[PDB]
Write a protein that binds this ligand. Structure first.
Ligand SMILES: CC(C)CCC[C@@H](C)[C@H]1CC[C@H]2[C@@H]3CC=C4C[C@@H](O)CC[C@]4(C)[C@H]3CC[C@]12C
Ligand SMILES: CC(C)CCC[C@@H](C)[C@H]1CC[C@H]2[C@@H]3CC=C4C[C@@H](O)CC[C@]4(C)[C@H]3CC[C@]12C
Ligand SMILES: CC(C)CCC[C@@H](C)[C@H]1CC[C@H]2[C@@H]3CC=C4C[C@@H](O)CC[C@]4(C)[C@H]3CC[C@]12C
Ligand SMILES: CC(C)CCC[C@@H](C)[C@H]1CC[C@H]2[C@@H]3CC=C4C[C@@H](O)CC[C@]4(C)[C@H]3CC[C@]12C
Ligand SMILES: CC(C)CCC[C@@H](C)[C@H]1CC[C@H]2[C@@H]3CC=C4C[C@@H](O)CC[C@]4(C)[C@H]3CC[C@]12C
Ligand SMILES: CC(C)CCC[C@@H](C)[C@H]1CC[C@H]2[C@@H]3CC=C4C[C@@H](O)CC[C@]4(C)[C@H]3CC[C@]12C
Ligand SMILES: CC(C)CCC[C@@H](C)[C@H]1CC[C@H]2[C@@H]3CC=C4C[C@@H](O)CC[C@]4(C)[C@H]3CC[C@]12C
Ligand SMILES: N[C@@H](CCC(=O)O)C(=O)O
Ligand SMILES: N[C@@H](CCC(=O)O)C(=O)O
Lengths: 750, 756
């Protein structure tokens, strides 16, 4: 029947008394004891005394509706400020649906279902016990802190398992945890199917940890199947296998080191003394205590055979949830006290403003924002009771790592707690420091030195290959081999793509020390020797070859000699342009110098004033071709001068590389004129030492032509030592002709 | 507590808003209440629908309040407990008219498995079969109406509108649905008011004042319940509002909301569900009197309120409800269909389950909610009870979630002939079918959206002022580009805006272009200068023909001819295209030619081999100085040919763009050496053999100093503005190359003297 306690603000209860002993009677007496203690306790409602209105639920939805209709039929009995209940998920859901319309808030103590966490459907519902999906955050935290990333998730067919697994999957994204595989465990589908499903979980040897959001029987039978298969695993299990020796039973299996999340509790000492003192005579308030006494002790009050039995003999143990009921009733009491201290300040008694329930403001404002201290504390200074914005409580979970080293088997040892912070005692875990790792589940292809990296993720998100590009292909973003500098390995900068301007200019001797020194030595000697004839300027003119030929010869030797030395220079934008201008003019004037002398001999077989005019006209024509070609060619620095797989070694002018073939063509016309001039000479008697030099020059042009072919093939792609040596040979041959031209002067003067 | 307690074998409850709660509704409460009673008696007096059992009712009142509805709804679930005014078992109830009333009752009845169907609760919050599982409807939900309003606004080209709503669950629910529909049709709401049901002075005046303070929006949408529409219309008359209201099914075609304040609701568009009036119900209501209607406790108040008298003191008690002062409510067919829903569903459930007898079998003592509703109500198909049509509209069918179908009408307040009455204007089956016959407020449909008007691409400055979703157009972009809606970016200084205005393309610069206007002027002198070179060549052609020994110009005259020969050629380069090769040669050509010619004259004025070497050395010294500065200037030739004269992008032009002042500075020391050697001559007092030539040199150099001292200021004042001002610079350079030919004519006339 209805339990009524005299008071002012009567409170409601919905415990499942029907007679159930360890779930119905215990919590009813718990809230009665808490209310009795707080009625006489100061600092909370000194004047007004709370009441009680306890109605059984019978663990049925229809019975729950019928009983809870009494809580809304009043003030639609004294106006009830709130009801306490929610032992079963369906009963709590139904009562929350009924009570939301009448603006009567409730606080729950055992409704851990995740379906009630939405405020869109249950706006005026709150609970003290944490819901079943807060364990997911602790799961990811402990998995990440222990370097475990490859997980084999195991679910359940029930709503609890599905909600837990979906919460874990959603929250693991921020924890960088990927699900290797997801499976389902039905309500005992088949004994033989469990072997198949555990094989489906263990198909991957890389993964070693497995989340176990399953009930007690499912976890026990899965562990039995694993022991039958004789597999080794570490299971970060859930409250279903929470510090229970019945689940493991006698099958040890691979349960060693299995992390278990278990709900905490307070060893209330004051309630034990009160509960041990109940008798069916003094405690006449309870209408179901007589039935409980009759059922528990197997006697009838009518036969007068119940006085001998008493609760003083049987030991008393709380069902890990008496703390939650006391917390809920004291949260309601503190909310009422906050009402009194904020709505009736003038009078210490119940003012006229508190006559209405005011449930809408009460629950929204001063129920979700309560921070009362822990009651009946065992001096563990935990407290931290605070309903969140989602109308749900928070609590701590005692981690119970399985161990068997001390008692042989079935020894649950506490390691740490999860209360707004992860705390694991590694020194207590059996996997101590002297071990080959704490059974590392690890990840897939995760450990890489960052020197080689591909990061393509062929399979799972955690899996990513780290294979380097063969030329290292200027890797910048560590994902795709970029092309910032080129297709080969750059200087790589600070681990990224780069473009090294490194190149060889051949300045410090290298393999062309000979030609570098030969060209400079020959140029100085030729210039000094040429000035000997100019000192007199009267002796040579009487033997023909006047100043017109002497000036051309002096200019020609100077231009070609200096053209060899200018080759050793930095190939800037100016150097490439003058590279064509180097041999485009020096080779032109020297060829035209001998052509004019040869033409004069042929024409005599004169015009001394116009003798130089024809020589420069041919030189200007060669310059006209040079200027018309360089504008089209537009010489510039060429970055690409190395093979595909080698680094940047040379920065030779790319435009001049194509112009090199045209440079020979430009010199071909000068060579053709020289050959034509030599033929016009025909007989060369008396003082004709230049004819022998002309024949040597013809061989020199042939030698240059012979050396021109490797320039296109190999002599340009090499270190340019051969290319620089060719300039010295051309200059030396021109100086050899000069040595065979001013050979009379070498001997006549001496 | 006043209620109807008609008993029977099976009881069907009901919830109607009789009280609007001292007052009594005349058209929404009483009219719908009598429809249910009219349908109930027809079911009893029927042979082809549920025979042998009579149906009772348990109709209550709601006072248009959701909280009061819950208290009355608790009477329905009283008989479903059986644990301890005898209660009667109820198979199902009829939902309240208001959406807020239906939501509260549906949530309560869902737990006890009592089916409920409404007749006017058009709300989009319901029809979600996860919370209000036991709730079907005959009317379409509140999301087709949002589309209908959006289509109507788009049809009349109405963009800037204002919306209001009630604090009840019917108000804000449909506003959100209307938001996407407005956004899809490129229209926006000015403001979204949320006015409550508290009073008029506190909130209603403020809502009207906010709309009145901005007369820009002349058309607004009224998505509010009928309860709140009465006081707002009255409040509009006090504030003298002149808006064109667009109402939902709340206002509908009611003729009682606008009573005494009809002068403000002129031309108001109202949306009402289509429903063919039933002729049978007309006879029942028109022959209804308090002397034969003792079944309705609220009828006495309705009679005392509609016909003003007391049962004006005592009335004649002979007048009856006639067509002169009575109109059919639009949502009456829905109420009749709602009653017949259970009547047909229970017939399909009673006879089929117990074919043995057509009575209450033993299996029907305890009713079921899951099987009765889900299977039978969701598939019941039956033709309209009292209607002369047999089309798809006559038959009533529940959808997957339980609904009707979109048949919204478009009414209009269309006063004509001195009588105030609504008149149909269109239909919204699935397409717009409005006909242009509505009599608007003043003389035509009111125009709106004056905050934003269609502008032109010329401005492209669609900036947003402090208000929202109405941009005003202002001209911007003085030959810029607009690549965004509200920004006018400045393009490149050397480019011109494109026709599409999305970019700023490079305009084609104008060079000298050879044959042209006065810019081609120096070309004529350049052509004349070429003739001077030919004349100089002619002088050279006559020079080699036995040159005079006393002239002593074996090679100095040739150098002078060479100097002046390229001087005319240098003019061609300056008037040619600004090529990188030409730009480099322009500075080198002018400096070398001027220095060489000046050096030759100075050397001649001041054996013969040494002066030739000295002339080449000094010219070479200037030449190597030119290339010394060239490497710091010509190195920008790849970067040359760049646009210049960037004065607000006023037709920018391309030129060398490098060594602008450097070229002027280069010519400074080129002529400084020339003038220094000119004054060093001291008239060259020497033998008369070359004194006449020296006098010619002393005259040409003196004129050269004067023109050079005058040409340089001309270069400075003509800087920039190419092809208009650089033409003068080009003309001066061509003139500079022309005058030195005249200076070279002094040796020519001396050679002419030798000729004859
Ligand atoms: C094509 C052009 C640009 C080449 C450079 C200029 C040439 C044509 C000029 C520069 C200096 C000139 C020389 C200067 C002096 C003399 C001495 C005289 O007794 C005969 C002519 C002669 C030998 C000239 C010939 C032409 C010459 C070589
Ligand atoms: C005749 C004396 C006085 C002067 C010598 C003539 C000089 C100035 C002339 C002769 C031929 C000319 C070239 C003919 C063709 C071209 C190609 C054109 O795309 C750029 C200019 C360029 C490269 C000309 C530059 C000037 C040039 C080299
Ligand atoms: C022998 C005497 C008369 C001197 C002749 C000089 C002639 C050949 C030179 C002097 C100036 C020269 C021009 C200077 C600039 C340009 C612009 C270029 O884009 C094409 C070539 C062109 C059009 C040149 C053609 C050749 C040219 C006309
Ligand atoms: C001939 C055409 C193609 C270009 C003419 C450009 C003029 C302005 C320049 C360019 C290169 C110059 C020559 C470069 C070098 C020398 C050698 C020096 O000891 C006397 C002057 C002399 C001979 C210059 C005369 C002027 C010159 C010819
Ligand atoms: C392309 C260029 C470099 C060719 C050479 C141009 C210059 C340097 C040449 C052309 C004509 C030459 C002159 C020709 C004749 C003589 C007379 C002699 O008794 C002394 C040298 C002297 C005075 C020469 C000096 C150098 C000279 C001026
Ligand atoms: C033919 C020889 C004997 C006499 C004439 C030499 C002339 C053509 C040479 C001598 C020095 C040279 C210059 C040296 C350096 C540069 C800077 C570079 O960024 C562009 C080319 C430029 C501006 C060269 C142009 C050609 C140049 C002026
Ligand atoms: C000595 C005379 C007769 C002929 C040579 C004249 C010289 C001064 C001229 C002729 C062609 C000219 C080149 C033509 C084109 C370019 C490319 C440009 O990006 C930089 C300047 C540069 C490299 C010019 C430098 C000066 C240049 C080398
Ligand atoms: N937590 C379970 C039951 C709680 C309990 O048995 O204590 C539920 O969802 O209702
Ligand atoms: N159908 C409107 C009201 C109907 C009426 O007032 O009769 C609503 O959504 O509640």
């Amino acid at each position: 029947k209805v339990l009524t306690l005299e008071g002012d603000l009567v409170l409601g209860g919905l415990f499942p008394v029907h007679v159930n002993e360890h779930r119905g009677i215990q919590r009813l007496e718990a809230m009665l004891f808490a209310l009795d203690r707080i009625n006489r306790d100061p600092h909370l409602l000194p004047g007004v005394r709370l009441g009680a209105h306890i109605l059984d639920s019978c663990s049925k939805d229809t019975h729950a509706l019928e009983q809870a209709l009494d809580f809304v039929r009043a003030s639609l009995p004294t106006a009830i400020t709130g009801v306490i209940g929610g032992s079963y998920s369906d009963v709590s859901i139904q009562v929350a649906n009924l009570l939301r319309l009448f603006q009567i808030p409730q606080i729950s103590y055992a409704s851990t279902s995740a379906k009630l966490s939405d405020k869109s459907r249950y706006d005026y519902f709150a609970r003290t016990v944490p819901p079943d999906f807060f364990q997911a955050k602790a799961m990811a935290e402990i998995l990440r802190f222990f370097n475990w990333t490859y997980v084999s998730t195991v679910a359940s067919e029930g709503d609890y398992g599905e909600t837990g697994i979906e919460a874990f999957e959603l929250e693991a994204r921020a924890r960088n945890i990927c699900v290797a595989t997801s499976e389902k465990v039905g309500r005992a589908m088949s004994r033989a199917a469990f072997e198949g499903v555990v094989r489906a979980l263990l198909q991957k040897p890389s993964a070693r940890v497995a989340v176990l959001f399953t009930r007690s029987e499912d976890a026990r039978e899965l562990l039995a199947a694993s022991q039958r298969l004789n597999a080794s695993f570490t299971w970060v299990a859930s409250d279903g296998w929470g510090a229970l020796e019945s689940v493991v039973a006698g099958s040890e299996g691979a349960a060693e080191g299995a992390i278990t999340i278990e709900l905490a509790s307070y060893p209330i000492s004051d309630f034990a003394s009160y509960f041990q003192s109940l008798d069916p005579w003094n405690n006449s308030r309870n209408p179901w205590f007589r039935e409980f006494w009759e059922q528990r002790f197997r006697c009838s009050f009518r036969q007068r055979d119940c006085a001998a039995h008493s609760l003083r003999a049987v030991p008393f143990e709380q069902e890990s949830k008496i703390m939650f009921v006391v917390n809920a009733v004291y949260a309601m009491a503190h909310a009422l006290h906050n009402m009194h201290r904020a709505l009736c300040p003038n009078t210490t008694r119940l003012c006229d403003a508190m006559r209405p329930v005011n449930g809408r403001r009460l629950y929204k404002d001063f129920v979700l924002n309560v921070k009362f201290d822990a009651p009946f504390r065992p001096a563990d200074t935990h407290n931290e009771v605070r309903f969140d914005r989602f109308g749900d409580g928070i609590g701590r979970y005692n981690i119970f790592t399985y161990l068997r080293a001390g008692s042989g088997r079935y020894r649950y040892q506490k390691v740490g707690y999860w209360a707004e912070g992860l705390t694991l005692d590694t020194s207590l875990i059996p996997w101590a420091s002297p071990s080959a790792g704490p059974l590392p589940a690890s990840r897939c292809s995760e450990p890489c030195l960052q020197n080689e990296v591909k990061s393509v993720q062929p399979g799972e998100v955690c899996c990513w290959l780290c294979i380097p590009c063969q030329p290292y292909e200027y890797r910048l973003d560590e994902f795709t081999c970029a092309d910032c500098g080129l297709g080969y390995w750059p200087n790589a900068s600070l681990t990224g793509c780069f473009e090294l301007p490194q190149e060889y200019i051949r300045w410090g001797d290298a393999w062309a020390v000979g030609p570098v020194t030969i060209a400079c030595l020959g140029a100085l000697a030729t210039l000094f020797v040429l000035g000997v004839f100019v000192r007199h300027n009267a002796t040579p003119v009487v033997k023909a070859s006047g100043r017109e030929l002497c000036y051309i010869l002096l200019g020609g030797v100077f231009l070609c000699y200096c053209m060899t030395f200018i080759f050793i220079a930095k190939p800037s934008t100016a150097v490439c342009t003058l590279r064509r201008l180097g041999l485009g003019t020096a080779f032109s004037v020297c060829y035209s110098a001998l052509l004019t002398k040869t033409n004069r001999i042929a024409r005599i077989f004169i015009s001394p004033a116009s003798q130089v005019a024809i020589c420069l006209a041919l030189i200007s024509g060669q310059l006209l071709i040079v200027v018309a070609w360089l504008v089209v060619e537009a010489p510039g620095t060429g970055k690409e001068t190395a093979p595909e797989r080698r680094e940047v070694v040379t920065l030779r002018c790319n435009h001049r590389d194509a112009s090199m073939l045209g440079s020979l063509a430009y010199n071909v016309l000068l060579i053709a004129l020289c050959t034509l001039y030599a033929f016009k000479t025909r007989k060369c008697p008396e003082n004709f030492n230049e004819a022998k030099f002309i024949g040597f020059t013809m061989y020199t042009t042939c030698i240059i032509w012979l050396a021109f072919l490797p320039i296109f093939y190999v002599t340009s792609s090499d270190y340019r030592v051969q290319t620089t040596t060719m300039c010295v040979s051309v200059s030396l041959s021109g100086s050899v002709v000069l040595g065979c031209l001013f050979a009379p002067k070498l001997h006549i003067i001496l | 507590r006043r209620e109807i307690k008609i008993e029977g074998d099976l009881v069907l409850g009901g919830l109607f808003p009789i009280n609007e709660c001292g007052r009594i509704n005349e058209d929404r409460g009483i009219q719908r209440l009598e429809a249910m009673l009219f349908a109930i008696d027809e079911i009893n007096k029927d042979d082809y629908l549920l025979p042998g059992v009579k149906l009772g009712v348990h109709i209550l009142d709601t006072c248009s309040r959701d909280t009061y509805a819950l208290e009355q709804s608790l009477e329905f679930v009283r008989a479903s407990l059986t644990k301890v005014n005898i209660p009667l078992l109820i198979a199902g109830v009829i939902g309240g008219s208001y959406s807020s009333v239906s939501i509260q009752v549906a949530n309560l009845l869902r737990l006890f498995q009592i089916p409920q169907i409404s007749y006017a609760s058009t709300s989009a919050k319901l029809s979600d079969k996860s919370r209000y599982d036991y709730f079907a409807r005959t009317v379409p939900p509140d999301f087709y109406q949002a589309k209908a309003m959006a289509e109507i606004l788009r049809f009349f080209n109405w963009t800037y509108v204002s919306t209001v709503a009630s604090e009840g669950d019917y108000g804000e629910t449909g506003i959100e649905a209307f938001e996407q529909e407005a956004r899809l049709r490129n229209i926006c709401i000015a403001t979204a008011e949320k006015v409550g049901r508290s009073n008029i002075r506190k909130s209603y005046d403020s809502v009207i004042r906010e709309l009145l303070q901005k007369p820009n929006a002349r058309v607004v949408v009224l998505f509010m319940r009928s309860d709140d529409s009465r006081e707002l219309i009255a409040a509009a008359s006090r504030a003298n509002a002149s808006f064109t209201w667009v109402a939902s099914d709340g206002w509908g075609a009611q003729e009682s909301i606008i009573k005494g304040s009809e002068h403000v609701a002129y031309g108001a568009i109202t949306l009402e569900l289509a429903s063919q009036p039933v002729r049978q119900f007309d006879r029942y209501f028109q022959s209804l009197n308090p002397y034969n209607n003792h079944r309705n406790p609220w009828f006495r108040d309705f009679w005392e309120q509609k016909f003003q008298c007391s049962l004006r003191r005592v009335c004649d008690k002979h007048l009856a409800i006639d067509s002169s002062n009575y109109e059919q409510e639009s949502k009456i067919m829905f109420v009749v269909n709602a009653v017949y829903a259970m009547a047909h569903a229970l017939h399909k459930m009673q006879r089929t389950l117990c074919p043995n007898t057509t009575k209450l079998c033993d299996a029907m003592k305890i009713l079921d909610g899951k099987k009765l509703y889900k299977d039978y109500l969701l598939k019941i198909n039956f033709t309209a009870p009292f209607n002369p049509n047999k089309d798809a509209d006559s038959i009533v069918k529940f959808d997957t979630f339980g609904d009707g179908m979109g048949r919204y009408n478009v009414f209009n307040f269309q006063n004509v002939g001195g009588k105030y009455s609504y008149l149909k204007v269109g239909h919204w089956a699935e397409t717009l079918s409005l006909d242009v016959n509505s009599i608007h407020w003043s003389r035509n449909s009111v125009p709106t959206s004056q905050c934003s008007d269609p502008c032109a691409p010329n401005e492209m400055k669609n900036m947003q002022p402090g208000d929202v979703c109405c941009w005003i157009c202002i001209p911007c972009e003085p030959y810029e580009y607009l690549a965004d809606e509200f920004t006018c970016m400045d393009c490149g200084s050397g480019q011109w805006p494109t026709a599409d205005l999305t970019g700023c393309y490079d305009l084609p610069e104008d060079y000298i272009r050879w044959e042209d206007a006065w810019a081609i002027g120096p070309v004529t002198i350049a052509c004349l200068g070429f003739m001077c070179t030919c004349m100089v060549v002619t002088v050279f052609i006559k020079h080699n023909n036995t040159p005079l020994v006393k002239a002593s110009g074996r090679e100095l005259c040739y150098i002078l001819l060479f100097g002046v020969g390229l001087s005319y050629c240098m003019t061609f380069f300056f008037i040619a295209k600004p090529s990188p090769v030409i730009c480099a040669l322009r500075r080198l050509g002018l400096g070398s030619s001027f220095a060489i010619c000046y050096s030759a004259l100075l050397t001649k004025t001041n054996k013969f081999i040494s002066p030739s070497s000295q002339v080449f050395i000094c010219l070479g010294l200037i030449l190597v100085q030119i290339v010394m500065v060239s490497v710091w200037l010509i190195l920008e030739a790849p970067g040359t040919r760049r646009y210049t004269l960037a004065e607000k992008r006023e037709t920018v032009i391309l030129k060398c763009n490098v060594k602008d002042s450097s070229m002027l500075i280069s010519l400074t020391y080129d002529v400084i050496l020339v003038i220094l050697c000119t004054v060093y001559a001291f008239k060259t007092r020497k033998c008369p053999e070359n004194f006449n030539e020296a006098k010619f040199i002393g005259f040409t150099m003196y004129t050269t100093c004067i023109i050079w001292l005058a040409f340089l200021p001309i270069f400075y004042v003509t800087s920039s503005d190419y092809r208009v001002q650089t033409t003068t610079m080009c003309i001066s350079v061509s003139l500079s190359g022309f005058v030195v030919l005249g200076c070279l004519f002094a040796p020519k006339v001396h050679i002419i003297l030798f000729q004859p």
